[PDB]
Design a protein around this ligand. Structure first.
Ligand SMILES: CCCCCCCCCCCCCCCCCC(=O)OC[C@H](COP(=O)([O-])OCC(O)COP(=O)([O-])OC[C@@H](COC(=O)CCCCCCCCCCCCCCCCC)OC(=O)CCCCCCCCCCCCCCCCC)OC(=O)CCCCCCCCCCCCCCCCC
Ligand SMILES: CCCCCCCCCCCCCCCCCC(=O)OC[C@H](COP(=O)(O)OCCN)OC(=O)CCCCCCCCCCCCCCCCC
Ligand code: SF4
Ligand code: SF4
Ligand code: SF4
Ligand code: SF4
Ligand code: FES
Ligand SMILES: [K+]
Ligand SMILES: [Zn+2]
Lengths: 96, 48, 264, 388, 113, 108, 125, 115, 176, 96, 210
């Protein structure tokens, strides 16, 4: 920013940009190093009623794998899942 | 200090020529900064 | 044999002798009912209520440790009606308990840090003050910090039914109640050192071993004792090539799980 | 075979991608075969992790691909979340995405610049690396460590964003796009750059699938495939960005693809800052998420769960799984296997550069010796994850 | 009308997809004859080829055909077909439909240990 | 500070071992060390180039590059922040500045 | 097709262990005892295998616990006794098996605490 | 039952063949190895060492194992032939720096604890 | 949703062709390349002056581990071995015995600053905020032994920097 | 209190010292045995006891979140002073 | 999907498809497939007799309903508690159908598995690694040798019975002017923490008695 007016124009002309508007170095727009103390929000399970852990059990709701065919003990052909769709060309800017 | 330079070059320290018996007129090293000024010097806080 | 009676455990029938406790029946299929006031080598008391379990089609959860089983019962050990009981019971035992884990000796091998994690809720809704009890000096071996006591009456039944001494007991009423001797008496006996084990909390920790090493950095190494002819099986807990302590090892034929004070 | 040469990168030059001992079989000027030796950095990461807790193991994934750090941690985090059967809070999913794109900016800047450093193009290395320095602060101001943040953990993140950060990330993003346009003003249209990366290392569409390629290698030869679009994980289903696709298949397109991905990262960050939601930063499940110090020092249960989660860790249900993400270089994933204990039984790390390097032999056929420089670079090979 | 490029490197453009596909699906059905008619592979492969071929006849134009086949680019269906065909011949040598070759040990696939 | 970016390994002046030192890669490092013309100062950078860092107990990791060569300056931190590394280099120059070759020679 | 090899299985020569640790170390097979401080018996299930102990001296510089044996920290888990024995047999380590010691279950009865004529009755609660 | 899938050799009679094939491979290579790496041990010493490693495996009986032991040998030789190894890797079989480790009983009882 | 990067068709009109022909024989795009570089010559370098200036850091920064003391002066650490049990690299060694006055305190406490990975876990697991990491990082040493900090070295550093460690923790303990 | 051995070496608050014959002290030759002189045990004893009214008083080391966990200290016994396990500050009930 | 932020929302539709796609492969190649199971986090598992490595992998790569073009991953899991201690695992991708399947076998030290390089060129190196780190041998591999370990590594690291610290540590010796090797000695031993909690964690996975 300290650059003189003559130099400011030159490096815009050579690069063909408004370099002054978008400078590479931070001067003051950054946040100040000190900020007022925060006050963080609490989680959705912070309650004093009807909040037993057994209902929101993260892990015990998991179960072992299910077994489809086990050797120890007219149907339509089935794919592993629906076939992928065809992506649509980006209409914001389809071509570079 | 000079807040009219870009971030990083706006807070610099000039080192004494002597300290703790060492002739630091030349052999200046970053560890000579006392802890209190370290927080301000490294831009960890605003108030000196 | 025709003595047995079929009892279901989640429907999985298993035959157990009449008079078998609910907890014992659930042990056969590998389910270890959580407990605090039970020890199969000590008479039954049933006061922690941490073992409460559901009985199929009944409005009341029956105490696992003491309740005899009748024919054709089913024991739901994972229903929501059973998790509610435990989470509630573990809600109380951690109410008056202090924040001593970082300095309590048992921290790392505690029945209250484990059964709290597995069974108890994950947060506390206690907004009041805390209890605090004054310590006792009952010997140069068993360091005692009774603020962490949770009234299991193990130390009590053990002394009256294993060592044969009748010095330990509970005095008072209700939450004011305390566990101790009520007088400055050193509970001394060759078996006296075995209350350091049964006590599931840091309310009675070994004094020589105190502030020596956390349980999770020691390398156990089964061995035998030679202090006397009985030859008790023992686990020589060590660390960095340094014998940090000695603990009983289970063996029914020789010494169950007790070791004389000298051996300890 | 005429005269096999052990072309070695052991005397590493200023490229900072690792050390590579290369054994080739030339025929005069033209190369005819290759045989990379990759044991030079195998530290055994995949074996140590079997002795650590899932929490203790997290920092390893940071040191696999040491230019795409937070992306790596996210890959590991999703795997543990998936086996834990819990979801991070919605605010956490945005933060992780917010830095995934920032990390992707970090990775490409290294990839494009050093890939240009090797070919003698030295000026673009600095300009963009200055931005890397600015981005390091965002890493440093949230996690306190310039590179190996370990910010992302199973269950969300560790600490919430400090004040004045999002208002400062926005400052970086706004002017950043000017930086790239300067970069393109010396690489894209320059004829010297074109001569080096056009019709070089062309990979056929079918082969790319067979050898096991992923990322800009697959999408650099037409294949329409990006896990951020087909198998989204956190919020990518709730943002707008166009997966660039090349057609020639040569190096030039991959260079174009990477430069285009960085722009498509800005279009995402612009949406992360505006859509950032409020709430907590970690799963409110104390048994998996250790409580904040405030509750630990006040409540009983809040302490125990801070006394076991830092000595024994959290148990994980028995099982195994493979989870993958569109890491900057390519598909990245782990075949974690848990047997019920707080320590993983096994953890195979699918490094995207592992397959992209084995396929170097195929790509190097019938090209001059100097072209292996522009071929290895275009694959963005970092031997941190090749060897592990 | 014909495409200039297929959108992929190493997958050229088929001049007449209609004629090419009718050869392959028809060619494939020939190979499936040897495979025992009770074999599962024949039962399902047969179905997935009759439907594919049937739609080839209906549409006279390439573009509208693709969006009904749901195999991606029309050329990709052709290259998919070749691998499908090449598999059929091998399956005759392997004879997968045979009973299980050998059961696993008592606790081979048991997890956790 | 005059510290150029690239120099031929056989016309170097100081080696900055940065990163882990695998058993496979160890012989190459020693070979390079012997080709350095004197004076040659070796600087260990990071924590895996000092004591094996995170990988101290890895079978295929040389527990500290000092085993393979004699180190002059040790820089901690994994990674040592780009500024800390610069302190080491500045520190090295002083360490050189406290050398008195000729004086010792004159007093032989 | 399939040959018929009728020899005792042994891979001692391919694993790569120096013989010093093969014929010398005395592996140990046992069901880990119960840590008496707790009543949880989830860790008395799987048969662990381990070697004998060896001296740990003290590093003079810091008094740490240095060691030379690389197999001191080696532990393996096996589902049954036989699965463990085989792994030792096919590697050469002279093993020593110890029988599982299942706690002999007891006949607990709360109602005995209050006896008319049995000494089992307790004088307190 | 002992029905086991073999690797290369269906019986010891064929398996022992590759061993003799292999031994010649080393026996004719030791002269190259010494000169290639400019080691400082006479061509005679290498073959004598070579016999030892072959000799210590004489007790083997399993056809599969001998196939495996052979398979490793080719890799060891191929690295040596191609000069992929390095002067250091070649001498690791001889144990120069290692001082004489005592082996008789009274030697052990005077130095330390290792049996 | 995708997009094409290199699919431009050069229009075959004479004027357009003359441009691509003009570009080759006059190096114009290369002349442009010399332009961007020229601009950067007249920009202001982003080089700070070290050591007279420092790179901006944050309160959360991780540096040289140190051990704190209460305002009274007493050691905060109570030898709970959480930090040892969590340090991923096992760079922490600890021993403790009941002090003369019967208070749980350490006797041997060592951190291996070469096995450390500077992960910050130690300061996370401390229930009493004893072991922390100061904002210092310039502690390169000429010998390996110097980088093995025992209890005495850690305590001195804590006392040495405590005027700052508290200042950083003060501004940042709320986020934790 | 830094009380030195007759051999001339300082003694730490842990009491360790390299006695006369041990060679390990040779390392200090040309260098110094760095010790910290702010002995923890001494400083706490300097701090005075505090008088409280009820039998139970709560200690947190001051600062709440910046101090040790909260602990409640019984004070029924008057023949001794209650002590906080973490910080060690003492308390005592007054005129009783 | 459900209103519980601390739990993972199940996607049952994808789970149903795998079960439907389950028998599809169990019926088609019953000579090899031993066991097919689907995990609750939507991941299909196929258990195959080791012989059927090529018939099964080759099928899915090319069948008209599998189309698993790319090999995601290939490793092995050492498990010393089974007669076939090792356990190969193939992770397959399918761009067309956008799904992943996992195929597992079982082998041991002395029972090689046919190289799958013909099916996929991806496994050219992954099979070197498995041999290098675990010791399993792959038949007909074009070029099988060590890829990771150091030259002349007398052992297979990733086996569960291989000590973490190895058997030899390097060092430089001036007497011989070359790097050397010696039996490993550690300044500080690797402390072995014992973490297992003695209380049953998940009742669902409980192994029934013996
Ligand atoms: C060749 C003959 C033509 C000379 C052209 C150079 C010139 O005079 O331009 C200076 C002048 C300063 O350039 P700038 O980039 O605009 O200044 C940026 C800030 O003002 C920067 O302002 P600042 O306040 O930060 O400047 C601080 C500076 C104070 O110095 C200055 O600000 C100006 C010094 C420029 C001297 C030229 O303090 C110093 O460090 C003094 C260092 C002196 C360097 C050595 C100068 C003599 C070398 C040439 C001797 C042989 C000829 O250039 C112009 O602005 C336009 C004049 C035409 C230049 C083309
Ligand atoms: C050197 C000073 C810095 C120059 C800054 C860039 C500039 O002013 O010229 C760029 C100009 C743009 O060229 P271009 O982007 O390719 O678009 C036109 C397509 N025919 O390109 C030009 O038109 C520059 C043409 C310069 C004349 C050709 C070189 C003649 C050399 C002998 C004199
Ligand atoms: S007994 Fe000790 S470890 Fe257990 S909860 Fe109480 S204070 Fe914590
Ligand atoms: S002293 Fe121990 S065993 Fe006795 S009641 Fe209290 S907690 Fe239970
Ligand atoms: S920062 Fe991490 S690795 Fe370093 S001492 Fe602390 S816990 Fe250990
Ligand atoms: S975690 Fe803190 S209080 Fe506990 S031992 Fe470590 S430094 Fe001391
Ligand atoms: S164990 Fe049953 S109430 Fe305590
Ligand atoms: K106890
Ligand atoms: Zn206090």
């Amino acid at each position: 920013a300290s650059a003189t007016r003559f130099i400011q124009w030159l490096r815009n002309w050579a690069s063909g940009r408004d370099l002054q508007a978008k400078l590479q170095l931070r001067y003051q727009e950054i946040s100040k190093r000190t900020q007022p103390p925060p006050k963080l929000p609490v989680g959705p399970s912070h309650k004093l009623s009807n909040n037993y852990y057994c209902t929101r059990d993260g892990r015990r709701e998991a179960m072992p794998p299910s077994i489809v065919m086990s050797s120890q003990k007219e149907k339509k052909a089935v794919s592993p899942a629906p076939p992928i769709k065809r992506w649509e060309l980006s209409q914001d800017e389809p071509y570079l | 200090e000079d807040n009219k330079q870009f971030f990083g070059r706006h807070r610099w320290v000039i080192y004494t020529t002597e300290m703790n018996g060492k002739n630091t007129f030349w052999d200046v090293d970053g560890s000579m900064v006392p802890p209190e000024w370290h927080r301000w010097l490294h831009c960890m806080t605003d108030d000196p | 044999a025709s003595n047995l009676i079929e009892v279901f455990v989640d429907g999985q029938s298993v035959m157990v002798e009449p008079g078998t406790t609910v907890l014992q029946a659930c042990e056969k299929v590998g389910m270890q009912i959580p407990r605090f006031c039970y020890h199969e080598r000590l008479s039954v008391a049933g006061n922690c209520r941490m073992c409460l379990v559901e009985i199929e089609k009944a409005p009341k959860v029956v105490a696992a440790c003491a309740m005899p089983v009748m024919k054709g019962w089913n024991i739901l050990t994972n229903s929501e009606k059973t998790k509610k009981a435990r989470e509630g019971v573990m809600e109380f035992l951690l109410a008056n308990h202090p924040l001593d884990c970082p300095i309590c000796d048992q921290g790392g091998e505690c029945d209250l840090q484990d059964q709290s994690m597995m069974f108890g809720s994950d947060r506390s809704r206690f907004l009041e003050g805390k209890r605090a009890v004054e310590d006792k000096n009952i010997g140069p071996l068993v360091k005692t910090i009774m603020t962490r006591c949770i009234q299991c009456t193990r130390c009590i039944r053990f002394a009256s039914e294993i060592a044969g001494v009748d010095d330990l007991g509970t005095t008072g009423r209700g939450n004011d109640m305390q566990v101790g001797t009520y007088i400055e008496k050193m509970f001394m006996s060759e078996l006296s050192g075995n209350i350091i084990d049964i006590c599931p909390v840091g309310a009675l920790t070994s004094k020589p071993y105190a502030f020596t090493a956390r349980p999770w950095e020691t390398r156990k190494t089964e061995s035998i004792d030679v202090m006397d002819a009985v030859g008790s099986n023992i686990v020589v807990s060590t660390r960095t090539g340094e014998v940090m302590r000695i603990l009983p090892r289970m063996h029914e034929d020789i010494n169950e799980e007790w070791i004389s004070d000298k051996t300890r | 075979l005429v005269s096999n040469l052990t072309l070695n990168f052991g005397p590493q030059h200023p490229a900072a991608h690792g050390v590579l001992r290369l054994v080739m079989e030339l025929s005069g000027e033209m190369v005819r075969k290759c045989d990379p030796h990759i044991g030079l950095l195998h530290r055994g990461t995949e074996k140590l992790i079997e002795y650590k807790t899932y929490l203790q193991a997290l920092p390893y994934f940071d040191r696999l691909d040491y230019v795409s750090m937070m992306c790596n941690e996210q890959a590991y985090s999703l795997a543990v979340e998936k086996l834990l059967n819990i979801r991070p809070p919605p605010r956490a999913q945005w933060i992780r995405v917010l830095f995934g794109e920032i990390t992707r900016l970090l990775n490409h800047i290294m990839a494009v610049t050093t890939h240009a450093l090797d070919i003698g193009a030295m000026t673009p290395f600095f300009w963009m690396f200055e931005e890397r320095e600015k981005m390091f602060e965002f890493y440093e101001r949230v996690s306190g460590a310039r590179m190996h943040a370990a910010y992302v953990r199973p269950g969300g993140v560790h600490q919430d964003l400090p004040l004045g950060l999002m208002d400062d990330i926005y400052e970086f993003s706004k002017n950043f796009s000017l930086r790239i346009d300067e970069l393109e003003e010396m690489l894209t249209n320059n004829r010297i750059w074109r001569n080096r990366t056009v019709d070089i290392g062309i990979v056929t569409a079918e082969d790319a699938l067979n050898y096991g390629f992923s990322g800009v290698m697959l999408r650099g030869s037409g294949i329409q495939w990006d896990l951020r679009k087909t198998q989204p994980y956190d919020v990518y289903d709730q943002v707008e960005f166009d997966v660039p696709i090349g057609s020639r298949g040569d190096c030039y397109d991959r260079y174009l693809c990477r430069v285009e991905e960085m722009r498509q990262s800005i279009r995402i960050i612009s949406q992360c800052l505006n859509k950032m939601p409020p709430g907590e930063i970690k799963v409110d499940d104390a048994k998996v998420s250790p409580p904040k110090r405030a509750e630990m020092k006040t409540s009983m249960e809040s302490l125990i769960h801070h006394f076991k989660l830092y000595t024994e860790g959290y148990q994980v249900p028995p099982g195994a799984t493979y989870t993958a993400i569109e890491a900057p270089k390519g598909e990245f994933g782990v075949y974690l296997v848990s047997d019920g204990s707080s320590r993983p039984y096994r953890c195979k790390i699918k490094a995207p550069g592992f397959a992209h390097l084995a396929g170097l032999d195929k790509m190097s056929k019938g090209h001059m010796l100097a072209d292996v420089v522009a071929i290895i670079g275009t694959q963005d090979i970092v031997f941190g994850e090749v060897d592990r | 009308l014909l495409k200039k490029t297929t959108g992929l490197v190493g997958l050229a453009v088929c001049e007449t997809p209609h004629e090419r596909l009718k050869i392959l699906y028809t060619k494939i059905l020939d190979v499936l004859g040897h495979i025992p008619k009770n074999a599962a592979y024949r039962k399902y492969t047969e179905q997935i080829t009759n439907e594919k071929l049937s739609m080839v006849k209906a549409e006279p134009d390439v573009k509208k055909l693709e969006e009904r086949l749901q195999g991606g680019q029309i050329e990709e269906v052709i290259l998919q077909a070749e691998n499908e065909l090449s598999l059929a011949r091998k399956m005759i040598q392997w004879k997968p439909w045979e009973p299980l070759v050998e059961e696993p040990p008592a606790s081979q696939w048991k997890w956790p240990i | 500070f005059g510290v150029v970016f690239r120099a031929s390994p056989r016309q170097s002046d100081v080696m900055i071992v940065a990163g882990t030192l695998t058993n496979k890669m160890a012989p190459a490092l020693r070979k390079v060390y012997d080709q350095m013309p004197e004076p040659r100062y070796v600087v260990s950078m990071g924590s895996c180039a000092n004591g094996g860092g995170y990988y101290h107990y890895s079978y295929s990791v040389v527990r500290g590059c000092d085993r393979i060569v004699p180190v002059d300056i040790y820089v901690p931190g994994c990674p040592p922040t780009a500024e800390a590394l610069l302190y080491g280099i500045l520190q090295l120059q002083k360490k050189i500045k406290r050398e008195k070759r000729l004086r010792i020679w004159y007093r032989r | 097709q399939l040959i018929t090899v009728d020899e005792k299985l042994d891979i001692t020569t391919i694993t790569g262990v120096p013989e010093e640790h093969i014929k010398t170390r005395k592996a140990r097979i046992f069901v880990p005892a119960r840590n008496n401080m707790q009543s949880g018996v989830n860790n008395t299930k799987k048969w662990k295998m381990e070697f004998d102990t060896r001296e740990r001296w003290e590093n003079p510089l810091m008094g740490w616990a240095s060691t030379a044996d690389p197999l001191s920290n080696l532990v393996l888990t096996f589902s049954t006794k036989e699965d463990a024995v085989a792994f030792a047999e096919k590697n050469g380590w002279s093993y020593d098996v110890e029988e599982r010691k299942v706690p002999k279950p007891k006949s607990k009865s709360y109602g005995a605490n209050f006896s008319w004529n049995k000494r089992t009755r307790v004088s307190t609660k | 039952s002992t029905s086991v899938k073999p690797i290369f050799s269906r019986d010891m009679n064929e398996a022992k063949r590759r061993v003799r094939e292999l031994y010649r491979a080393w026996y004719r290579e030791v002269p190259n190895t010494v000169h290639l790496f400019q080691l400082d041990i006479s061509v005679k010493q290498g073959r004598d060492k070579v016999r030892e490693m072959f000799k210590k495996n004489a007790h083997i009986t399993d056809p599969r194992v001998v196939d495996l032991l052979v398979i490793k040998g080719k890799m060891e030789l191929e690295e040596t032939i191609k000069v992929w190894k390095q002067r250091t890797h070649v001498m690791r079989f001889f144990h120069e720096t290692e001082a004489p480790r005592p082996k008789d009983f009274l030697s052990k009882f005077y130095v330390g604890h290792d049996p | 949703t995708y997009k094409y990067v290199n699919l431009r068709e050069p229009s075959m009109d004479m004027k357009s062709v003359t441009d691509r022909a003009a570009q080759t024989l006059l190096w114009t795009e290369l002349i442009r390349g010399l332009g961007m570089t020229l601009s950067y010559l007249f920009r202001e370098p982003a080089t700070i002056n070290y050591p007279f200036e420092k790179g901006p850091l944050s309160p959360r920064f991780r540096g040289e581990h140190a051990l704190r003391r209460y305002p009274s002066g007493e050691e905060r650490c109570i030898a709970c071995k959480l930090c040892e049990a969590v340090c991923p690299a096992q760079a922490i060694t600890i021993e403790a015995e009941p002090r003369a006055d019967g208070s749980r305190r350490t006797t041997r406490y060592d951190i291996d600053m070469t096995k450390c990975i500077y992960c910050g876990f130690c300061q996370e697991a401390c229930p009493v905020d004893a072991i922390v990491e100061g904002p210092n990082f310039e502690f390169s040493t000429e010998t390996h032994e110097e980088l093995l900090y025992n209890k005495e070295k850690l305590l001195n550093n804590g006392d040495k920097w405590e005027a700052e460690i508290a200042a950083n923790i003060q501004a940042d303990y709320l986020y934790r | 209190g830094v009380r030195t051995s007759p051999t001339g070496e300082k003694v730490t608050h842990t009491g360790q010292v390299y006695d006369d014959g041990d060679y390990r002290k040779v390392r200090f030759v040309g260098r110094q045995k760095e010790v910290n002189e702010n002995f923890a045990i001494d400083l706490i004893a300097e701090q005075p006891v505090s008088q409280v009214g009820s039998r139970v008083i709560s200690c947190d080391g001051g600062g709440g979140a910046l101090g040790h966990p909260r602990v409640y200290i019984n004070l029924d016994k008057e023949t001794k002073t209650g002590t906080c396990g973490y910080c060690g500050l003492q308390f005592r009930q007054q005129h009783h | 999907a459900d209103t519980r932020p601390t739990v993972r929302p199940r996607n049952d539709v994808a789970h149903k498809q795998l079960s439907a796609f389950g028998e599809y492969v169990a019926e088609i190649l019953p000579k090899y497939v031993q066991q097919v199971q689907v995990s609750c986090f939507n991941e299909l598992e196929i258990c195959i007799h080791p012989d059927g490595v090529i018939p099964v992998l080759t099928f899915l790569r090319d069948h008209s309903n599998a189309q698993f073009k790319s090999l995601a991953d290939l490793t092995a899991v050492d498990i010393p508690t089974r007669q076939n201690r090792f356990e190969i695992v193939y992770n397959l991708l399918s761009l067309r159908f956008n799904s992943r399947i996992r195929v597992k076998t079982y082998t041991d030290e002395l029972t090689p598995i046919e190289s799958s390089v013909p099916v996929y060129k991806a496994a050219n190196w992954y099979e070197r690694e498995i041999w290098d780190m675990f010791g399993v041998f792959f038949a007909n591999h074009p070029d099988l040798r060590r890829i990771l370990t150091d030259y002349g590594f007398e052992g297979h690291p990733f086996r569960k019975d291989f000590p973490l610290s190895g058997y030899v540590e390097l060092r430089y010796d001036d007497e011989v002017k070359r790097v050397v090797a010696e039996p490993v000695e550690l300044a500080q031993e690797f402390r072995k923490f014992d973490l297992n909690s003695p209380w049953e964690a998940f009742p669902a996975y409980r192994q029934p008695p013996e």
